Design an enzyme around this catalytic site. Structure first.
Site, short mmCIF file in Angstrom:
data_model
loop_
_atom_site.label_atom_id
_atom_site.label_comp_id
_atom_site.label_asym_id
_atom_site.label_seq_id
_atom_site.Cartn_x
_atom_site.Cartn_y
_atom_site.Cartn_z
N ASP A 170 0.73 -1.28 0.00
CA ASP A 170 0.00 0.00 0.00
C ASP A 170 0.75 1.32 0.00
O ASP A 170 1.30 1.63 1.03
CB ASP A 170 -0.62 0.11 1.42
CG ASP A 170 -1.72 1.10 1.63
OD1 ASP A 170 -2.39 1.52 0.74
OD2 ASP A 170 -1.92 1.47 2.86
N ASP A 196 -2.67 5.60 -4.81
CA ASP A 196 -2.66 4.58 -3.73
C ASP A 196 -2.90 3.16 -4.12
O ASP A 196 -4.03 2.78 -4.26
CB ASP A 196 -3.91 5.02 -2.92
CG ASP A 196 -4.50 4.27 -1.75
OD1 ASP A 196 -5.69 4.36 -1.51
OD2 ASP A 196 -3.70 3.60 -0.99
C1 LIG Z 1 -3.10 5.35 8.90
C2 LIG Z 1 -3.59 6.32 7.78
C3 LIG Z 1 -4.26 5.54 6.63
C4 LIG Z 1 -3.96 6.18 5.34
N1 LIG Z 1 -4.47 5.56 4.14
C5 LIG Z 1 -5.76 5.39 3.91
O1 LIG Z 1 -6.62 5.71 4.73
C6 LIG Z 1 -6.13 4.84 2.51
C7 LIG Z 1 -6.95 6.00 1.76
C8 LIG Z 1 -6.96 3.57 2.56
C9 LIG Z 1 -6.01 2.44 2.95
O2 LIG Z 1 -4.80 2.54 2.16
C10 LIG Z 1 -6.67 1.05 2.80
N2 LIG Z 1 -6.93 0.78 1.39
C11 LIG Z 1 -5.74 -0.04 3.37
C12 LIG Z 1 -6.49 -1.35 3.48
C13 LIG Z 1 -7.93 -1.06 3.91
C14 LIG Z 1 -8.81 -2.18 3.39
C15 LIG Z 1 -9.76 -2.82 4.19
C16 LIG Z 1 -10.54 -3.87 3.67
C17 LIG Z 1 -10.36 -4.29 2.35
O3 LIG Z 1 -11.15 -5.36 1.82
C18 LIG Z 1 -12.61 -5.35 1.80
C19 LIG Z 1 -9.40 -3.66 1.56
O4 LIG Z 1 -9.20 -4.06 0.19
C20 LIG Z 1 -7.93 -3.60 -0.27
C21 LIG Z 1 -7.63 -4.15 -1.65
C22 LIG Z 1 -6.19 -3.75 -2.04
O5 LIG Z 1 -5.74 -4.64 -3.05
C23 LIG Z 1 -4.76 -3.97 -3.79
C24 LIG Z 1 -8.62 -2.60 2.08
C25 LIG Z 1 -5.87 -2.30 4.53
C26 LIG Z 1 -4.61 -2.55 4.06
C27 LIG Z 1 -5.86 -1.62 5.86
#
Ligand SMILES: CCCCNC(=O)[C@H](C)C[C@H](O)[C@@H](N)C[C@H](Cc1ccc(OC)c(OCCCOC)c1)C(C)C
Length: 333
Positions: A35, A219
């Site tokens: 990520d 991202d």
């Molecule tokens: C600590 C500050 C966070 C900063 N970053 C964010 O908030 C981003 C906008 C969102 C995150 O990067 C998020 N995608 C991460 C991810 C959140 C998530 C939760 C459930 C998921 O499944 C239903 C999911 O799917 C991710 C698919 C990624 O495949 C590439 C992602 C995991 C790794 C925690």
């Protein structure tokens, strides 16, 4: 230096792309999303209570079976766009594609089911900056970079379409056998974050939105392209899609006809043809097809910001530049 490395990733429904790392000596193998939206590493813990269904379904980290582990102990709670996981710190060696580093990560003992019970992957590897690292914990890339081994402070992502190779990261470079034409770089707006300046979104032929410049966080850990609820909503109005709770959708006949959307980054325009954004599993008047764009409100930490996730990287091979702080785009092949 002169090493170059890649992990190989698996693509899941185009919505979830993970690769594998190994923590601990003997290695424990976990699956993870690389990520750039965050900057910490976590995997589930053996200590997590299996009252949390997610833990009963994902591999956990037992550290008393690890000869290299090293106690830490501070709590740490990770908040994301879409779910929190809580847990505590620890250290052991992690191996990402042949490069071994000793990193401080989090053993999560609180893993909520939604969305965690729907994730194919076990944890997360933030490829973000120190700056967005909760706990002010050094991240894998900075450590790897310390080893003095890469030829370049750069990592790049290939996300494939789906049903060989699901994807591929390459640390210390970019595989020229998955891009074409030239790379085109956008300098990082502030630093300590993969945010770039975004000049305007065109739906069809006109800037319906983005119009006075906006933020686009690039991202890899996100699956869809998304924006504020408010411009989402608008864009959606245009295209002519409905709400379903979480995703918009259009009727499948309509499908292969929604206009193109464009993203104005650095004097170049990144267009997504209608196929690139609709998930067309039908072409029928009677059935709903959902789109690969969403609404996500990321707060002032960094957001409001549009997020360009997998929808986008899968069309444009992305290289993230550390040495120089910017991001370059090229055409995926
Ligand atoms: C600590 C500050 C966070 C900063 N970053 C964010 O908030 C981003 C906008 C969102 C995150 O990067 C998020 N995608 C991460 C991810 C959140 C998530 C939760 C459930 C998921 O499944 C239903 C999911 O799917 C991710 C698919 C990624 O495949 C590439 C992602 C995991 C790794 C925690």
């Amino acid at each position: 230096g002169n090493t170059t490395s890649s992990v190989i990733l698996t693509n899941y429904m185009d919505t979830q792309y993970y690769g594998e790392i190994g923590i601990g000596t003997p290695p424990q193998t976990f699956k993870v999303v690389f990520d750039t939206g965050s900057s910490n590493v976590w995997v589930p813990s053996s200590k997590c209570s299996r009252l949390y269904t997610a833990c009963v379904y994902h591999k956990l980290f037992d550290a008393s079976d690890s000869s290299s582990y090293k106690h830490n102990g501070t709590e740490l709670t990770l908040r994301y766009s879409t779910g929190t996981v809580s847990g505590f710190l620890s250290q052991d060696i992690i191996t990402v594609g042949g490069i071994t580093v000793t990193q401080m990560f989090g053993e999560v003992t609180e893993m909520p089911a939604l969305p965690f019970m729907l994730a194919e992957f076990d944890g997360v590897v933030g490829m973000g900056f120190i700056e967005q690292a909760i706990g002010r914990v050094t991240p894998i890339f900075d450590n790897i970079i310390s080893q003095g081994v890469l030829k370049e402070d750069v990592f790049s992502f290939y996300y494939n379409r789906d049903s060989s190779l699901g994807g591929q990261i390459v640390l210390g470079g970019s595989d020229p056998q998955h891009y074409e034409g030239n790379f085109h770089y956008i300098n990082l707006i502030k630093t300590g974050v993969w945010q770039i300046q975004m000049k305007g979104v065109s739906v069809g032929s006109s800037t319906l939105l983005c119009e006075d410049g906006c933020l686009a966080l690039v991202d890899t850990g996100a699956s869809y392209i998304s924006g504020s609820t408010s411009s989402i909503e608008k864009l959606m109005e245009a295209l002519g899609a409905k709400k379903r709770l979480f995703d918009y959708v259009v009727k499948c006949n309509e499908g292969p006809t929604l206009p193109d959307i464009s993203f104005h980054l650095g004097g170049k325009e990144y267009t997504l043809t209608s196929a690139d954004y609709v998930f067309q599993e039908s072409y029928s008047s009677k059935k709903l097809c959902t789109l690969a764009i969403h609404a996500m409100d990321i707060p002032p930490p960094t957001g409001p910001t549009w997020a360009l996730g997998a929808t986008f990287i899968r069309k444009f091979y992305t290289e993230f530049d550390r040495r120089n702080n910017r991001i370059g785009f090229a055409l995926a092949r």
